[PDB]
Ligand SMILES: Cc1cc2nc3c(=O)[nH]c(=O)nc-3n(C[C@H](O)[C@H](O)[C@H](O)COP(=O)(O)O)c2cc1C
Ligand SMILES: Cc1cc2nc3c(=O)[nH]c(=O)nc-3n(C[C@H](O)[C@H](O)[C@H](O)COP(=O)(O)O)c2cc1C
Ligand SMILES: N[C@@H](Cc1ccc(O)c(I)c1)C(=O)O
């Protein structure tokens with residue numbers, strides 16, 4: 109049941125040491141690749157980072173940026189992050205066996221929308237394969253882009269650490285859908 | 293049965309029957325989408341279900357006018373693709389589809405647009421599971437459609453999703469092999 113898959117899927121920010129088989133990641137990318145896209149451009153590109161040194165560099169640049177963000181954040185965002193016990197620390201960037209970086213092709217019509225739609229497919233596929241993920245979005249994408257030698261034609265959309273879930277925290281609530289009809 | 297099979301089978305539907313699916317089939321898809329992740333768990337999607345024939349007509353005509361101008365002016369890669377596929381500015385699915393599902397994003401929420409499009413991915417798979425078809429329709433100017441439905445300033449129209457039973461839709465277009473790199477470019 110698709111609803112069961114979607115309902116059960118939750119953020120995973122803590123992963124086991126063991127590396128899942130690459131085939132499970134590739135399966136999820138093949139699922140995502142079947143998604144629609146503006147002018148069927150398929151504007152998604154994937155980079156799987158496994159190198160330990162590289163993961164550490166990515167972790168460090170992101171944590172540096174997050175530190176500044178956490179020092180400056182306020183209001184509703186600050187309150188939410190505080191209540192959920194978030195901090196600038198992102199150990200999963202080093203500890204996840206894979207970092208799946210998802211890029212969009214700048215030139216494609218509705219490229220960014222299309223890649224995010226495909227990320228929806230991707231996350232469901234990872235859940236199907238029993239893997240965990242978090243759509244991590246650091247304050248500064250450019251530093252991470254440079255670390256992996258991103259071509260100028262591509263834009264990093266999200267970093268998805270992927271691994272076996274390790275006693276993840278509970279899914280947050282979902283308010284019921286409240287639809288409107290015809291007009292507001 | 294794999295998710296891959298569902299994703300693989302799902303394709304654009306621009307040809308709809310007029311027969312009205314039960315509301316619960318559409319609502320099911322929204323319920324699935326609503327389970328999606330979002331920035332700060334804001335759940336920044338809002339759904340407007342348009343069924344009124346006069347209103348669908350207004351939306352269709354405003355979109356068609358915008359498309360007509362677009363087709364007269366578009367050049368380059370998108371023009372080449374539309375031309376080869378013999379697309380035109382006429383949008384009969386905006387009349388034929390029993391539902392136009394207008395999907396909005398809450399502007400104030402962090403990563404609102406990303407989150408809504410992610411949820412749209414869930415939504416399309418759910419519609420496929422229910423045997424419904426759709427197309428993420430993105431007219432050249434959303435502002436005129438927004439005004440037609442009295443969109444509050446807090447919300448941005450992201451996509452118009454005509455939804456209904458497929459009426460022998462055209463085949464899925466090809467997919468290039470997924471492009472995967474390791475560590476660095
Ligand atoms: C962001 C986005 C915007 C789209 N906008 C339109 C549109 O304005 N008109 C249209 O006919 N199809 C639109 N589509 C549908 C695409 O043309 C379609 O997904 C693509 O041709 C692949 O179709 P397939 O899955 O049937 O192969 C859109 C799709 C996406 C993802
Ligand atoms: C566009 C987007 C960006 C996100 N960015 C982050 C992030 O930067 N850091 C993080 O820990 N989680 C991030 N998340 C995960 C959300 O916090 C998560 O989806 C939300 O809290 C709901 O989680 P749940 O499905 O487990 O209830 C992001 C999610 C989305 C959709
Ligand atoms: N909105 C126009 C053109 C069009 C068509 C398909 C597509 O994937 C994209 I992006 C744009 C039309 O609907 O004809």
Ligand SMILES: N[C@@H](Cc1ccc(O)c(I)c1)C(=O)O
Nearest residue numbers: 194245246331332333402403
């Ligand atoms: N990137 C920061 C803050 C954060 C956290 C969760 C979230 O859903 C969103 I949008 C932002 C962090 O990872 O802590």
Ligand SMILES: N[C@@H](Cc1ccc(O)c(I)c1)C(=O)O
Nearest residue numbers: 218219220221224405406409
């Ligand atoms: N990050 C952008 C918002 C944005 C813009 C375009 C787009 O296609 C999508 I998906 C999201 C910003 O905050 O400005």
Ligand SMILES: [Cl-]
Nearest residue numbers: 119242243329
């Ligand atoms: Cl998540």
Ligand SMILES: [Cl-]
Nearest residue numbers: 147148465466
């Ligand atoms: Cl094509």
Ligand SMILES: [Cl-]
Nearest residue numbers: 144304427428
């Ligand atoms: Cl489509």
Ligand SMILES: [Cl-]
Nearest residue numbers: 280281332333
């Ligand atoms: Cl919450």
Ligand SMILES: [Cl-]
Nearest residue numbers: 345348349387
């Ligand atoms: Cl009508």
Ligand SMILES: [Cl-]
Nearest residue numbers: 397399405448
């Ligand atoms: Cl916006």
Ligand SMILES: [Cl-]
Nearest residue numbers: 306307461462
């Ligand atoms: Cl069709």
